[PDB]
């Protein structure tokens, strides 16, 4: 529309002030108590302990994974998606890593029905581009160690190490170190939340060539049981200061404009000339509208097409490579032709199957077929 994803916000961020809330050891220990009771099953959580290989005090961290069901229940001790717990060298219990609260796509839950959002949220609405990769958490442990995790893990080429290597490069580029980053993040009591996007490491659906590749900072959260997240202009500033790639942002005051905007982009699945997987919308939510305490609250707007078709193509090719039956659920006749074109490309280049299995060549194979068909991915999806 007349709206533009932008990355020049970081300079209005000087008027704003980062939120800060310290950790209450008592609060944290009760949260861990309740988490361990849920791990002692017989809501349900699963706990995994990891060493922190570069921690000079041998810190360990405990990752808590809920299944997506439990987040729709009331009365959970926390709603973090991605949560890591620890004891410092002095025995203090702490949240080492806190992700976003599990958030949901439009119409996926009662709260993410458009009518529910109109009623129970207030603006302004932060429209943050949804980069297509894997989530990466970064924080600073008490002994100065820079902790890098994937959504539920941190050992070793794991996603978390690939994320860390990328962080090492960006910090080298700006002449800063991990230890300075760890001190800054602990100073803020915060987890940095980034999307790792690199076709050379792993392909997803949209492309990320050698430029464009790296860690896209889209969030900073307070390491506390409750959900408090930085406003996105403050995130973009932190990205600049610490060498992250920034996540594009639109701010729309009115919620009816948000719906119309998101629907317009959804016709193409593209915005400002670039393909876009979706938006994550950030605002304040009330238990019941009118007044009430407002807390931070996200919802997803994941554009259905042509990305569903691309995803079906990905899974159908893997099923072709493996011996399993390709699941054709949508875009029937064009997927018929895609699967025949793929079979021929595999016959003429037998090593593709191994590569495709390891998530290299997904995007190229799709784009080659669309070339052969002389179509844009959008029109192929619209058949
Ligand atoms: N601007 C953004 N704001 C929030 N999340 C983003 C953003 N851009 C990309 N993401 C990624 O989107 C994910 C949520 O959308 P997606 O549909 O990929 O969910 P998912 O991978 O099934 O994970 P979950 O089960 O945690 O929802 C986050 O885990 C995060 O890695
Ligand atoms: Mn999920
Ligand atoms: Mn994703």
Automatic annotation (TrEMBL):
Coiled coil: none annotated. ATP binds at residues 81, 102, 128-129, 131, 151, 195, 218, 282, 300, 302. The active site is at 130 (n6-amp-lysine intermediate). Residues 79-308 form the T4 RNA ligase 1-like N-terminal domain. AMP binds at residues 129-130, 195, 218, 282, 302. It comes from the Eukaryota. Mn(2+) binds at residues 130, 195. Belongs to the TRL1 family. This is tRNA ligase. The lineage of its organism: Eukaryota, Fungi, Dikarya, Ascomycota, Pezizomycotina. The chain holds residues 14 to 406 of 846 of the full protein.
